[PDB]
């Protein structure tokens, strides 16, 4: 009718809302410590499946207060449906993802990459986004990507959604464990943190190193999402001077950035497979006992026939 | 038009107690040979210890938790929808006649 123009018309200063942040991830990672820790609670409950978390964000220099949806998902294969619940068309302008990367575990890091490769293109298309649209997103995003201040090439966001992607890596206190521990060489980390740039930078991603128990970037990763997803300012330069805590912005990774980081280590060349550097962890569980099944009395019957024959 | 629960809550509310529903019947602990059997000298899978597998067993497949989490979101948007129109009447205060 005629109201819904008038009074809609009459629109007052405000902040954009309902921003769809989505988190996957294998499961068990610290994923829900990682984001319950962001969003202020020390950690909140674990589960299966979808789970809602409202980050409130509040904007001192505006004196406002934003609440942006954090949905955490489980690392199931078997609950990958319910996606469509999670992604919608109208919330799609407005998404961003962020990788849950436990490096206690680095072995499973880059085929769970490989499993998102899968999981979010065929969610993404299987919902059917007009070539308009999703073409205008792909551009302004890379445009986003070019125009960083604190690029082009071959293999730069040469497949991608268009959206601001994040990767967070977690667990960090851990990594001097497995250092000492597992004898982990420090050109395997330097060899893990190439092709981890090598991923973003084909993607348009950033990482930011972190650690609930170090308590480390949290408040740069605050800064970093709020600033991502509402457009606020940033100053963080491109922490990547220590390999303890390295952040990259989106936009400054290079491939030159990445090959000053192959010159590092020397000990087998960066082309080769993921899982042919990194040394596998060996399954300690042993297998259970073998069944100790009887013979029947069938089998046992006709054998002793043979015997009593034989005789 | 301030809501002293945000909208958000609506639905985080939902979730726990969805999420206290499911743990009603998941949280069981599972029954075990590990009693006596000793042998597997290790300290107990949250995943295994505590039956978290049910999920994977469902006789209708995930539709169920299709089924509730459409449920859930159809009532968090009509009620949203319900509160926006409220919040229409915001004009009241901020208008040139």
Same mark, same amino acid.
């Given at each position: 009718?005629?109201?819904?123009?008038?009074?809609?018309?009459?629109?007052?200063?405000?902040?954009?809302?309902?921003?769809n942040?989505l988190?996957?991830?294998?499961?068990?990672?610290?994923?829900?410590?990682?984001?319950?820790?962001?969003?202020?609670?020390?950690?909140?409950? *674990?589960?299966?499946?979808?789970?809602?978390?409202?980050?409130?964000?509040?904007?001192?220099?505006?004196?406002?207060?934003?609440?942006?949806?954090?949905?955490?998902?489980?690392?199931? %294969?078997?609950?990958?449906?319910?996606?469509? !619940?999670?992604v919608?068309?109208?919330?799609l302008?407005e998404t961003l993802?962020?990788?849950?990367?436990?490096?206690?575990?680095?072995?499973?890091?880059?085929?769970?990459?490989?499993?998102?490769?899968?999981?979010?293109?065929?969610?993404?298309?299987?919902?059917?986004?007009?070539?308009? *649209?999703?073409?205008?997103?792909?551009?302004?995003?890379?445009?986003?990507?070019?125009?960083?201040?604190?690029?082009?090439?071959?293999?730069?966001?040469?497949?991608?959604?268009?959206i601001?992607? %994040?990767?967070?890596?977690?667990?960090?206190?851990?990594?001097?464990?497995?250092?000492?521990?597992?004898?982990?060489?420090?050109?395997?980390?330097?060899?893990?943190?190439?092709?981890?740039?090598?991923?973003? %930078?084909?993607?348009?991603?950033?990482?930011?190193?972190?650690?609930?128990?170090?308590? *480390?970037?949290?408040?740069?990763?605050?800064?970093?999402?709020?600033?991502?997803?509402?457009?606020?300012?940033?100053?963080?330069?491109?922490?990547?001077?220590?390999?303890?805590?390295?952040?990259?912005?989106?936009?400054?990774?290079?491939?030159?950035?990445?090959?000053? %980081?192959?010159?590092?280590?020397?000990?087998?060349?960066?082309?080769?497979?993921?899982?042919? !550097?990194?040394?596998?962890?060996?399954?300690?569980?042993?297998?259970?006992?073998?069944?100790?099944?009887?013979?029947?009395?069938?089998?046992?019957?006709?054998?002793?026939?043979?015997?009593?024959?034989?005789? | 038009?301030?809501?002293?629960?945000?909208?958000?809550?609506?639905?985080?509310?939902?979730?726990?107690?969805?999420?206290?529903?499911?743990?009603?019947?998941?949280?069981?602990?599972?029954?075990?040979?590990?009693?006596?059997?000793?042998?597997?000298?290790?300290?107990?899978?949250?995943?295994?210890?505590?039956?978290?597998?049910?999920?994977?067993?469902?006789?209708?497949?995930?539709?169920?938790?299709?089924?509730?989490?459409?449920?859930?979101?159809?009532?968090?948007?009509?009620?949203?929808?319900?509160?926006?129109?409220?919040?229409?009447?915001?004009?009241?205060?901020?208008?040139?006649?």
């Open positions: 009718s005629s109201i819904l123009s008038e009074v809609s018309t009459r629109a007052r200063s405000k902040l954009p809302s309902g921003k942040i988190v996957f991830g294998e499961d068990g990672s610290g994923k829900t410590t990682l984001m319950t820790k962001l969003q202020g609670a020390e950690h909140g409950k *674990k589960g299966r499946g979808l789970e809602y978390l409202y980050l409130s964000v509040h904007d001192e220099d505006r004196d406002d207060h934003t609440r942006c949806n954090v949905w955490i998902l489980d690392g199931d %294969l078997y609950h990958k449906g319910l996606l469509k !619940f999670a919608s068309a109208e919330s302008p993802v962020i990788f849950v990367a436990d490096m206690s575990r680095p072995w499973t890091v880059m085929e769970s990459l490989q499993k998102w490769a899968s999981v979010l293109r065929e969610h993404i298309d299987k919902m059917k986004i007009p070539p308009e *649209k999703m073409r205008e997103l792909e551009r302004k995003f890379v445009k986003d990507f070019q125009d960083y201040m604190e690029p082009l090439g071959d293999n730069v966001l040469t497949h991608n959604l268009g601001p992607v %994040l990767v967070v890596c977690t667990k960090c206190d851990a990594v001097s464990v497995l250092e000492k521990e597992h004898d982990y060489r420090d050109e395997h980390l330097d060899f893990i943190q190439s092709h981890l740039r090598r991923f973003c %930078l084909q993607y348009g991603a950033a990482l930011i190193y972190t650690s609930v128990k170090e308590e *480390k970037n949290l408040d740069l990763l605050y800064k970093y999402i709020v600033h991502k997803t509402y457009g606020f300012h940033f100053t963080t330069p491109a922490l990547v001077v220590e390999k303890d805590a390295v952040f990259i912005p989106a936009g400054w990774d290079n491939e030159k950035k990445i090959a000053i %980081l192959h010159e590092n280590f020397t000990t087998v060349k960066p082309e080769d497979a993921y899982e042919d !550097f990194i040394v596998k962890p060996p399954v300690r569980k042993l297998v259970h006992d073998k069944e100790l099944a009887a013979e029947d009395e069938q089998v046992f019957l006709m054998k002793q026939q043979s015997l009593l024959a034989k005789q | 038009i301030y809501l002293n629960p945000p909208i958000e809550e609506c639905r985080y509310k939902l979730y726990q107690e969805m999420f206290a529903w499911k743990m009603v019947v998941l949280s069981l602990p599972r029954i075990q040979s590990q009693r006596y059997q000793v042998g597997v000298h290790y300290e107990l899978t949250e995943e295994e210890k505590f039956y978290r597998n049910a999920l994977t067993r469902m006789p209708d497949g995930p539709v169920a938790l299709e089924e509730s989490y459409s449920a859930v979101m159809g009532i968090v948007s009509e009620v949203e929808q319900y509160v926006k129109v409220w919040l229409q009447y915001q004009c009241l205060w901020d208008m040139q006649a």
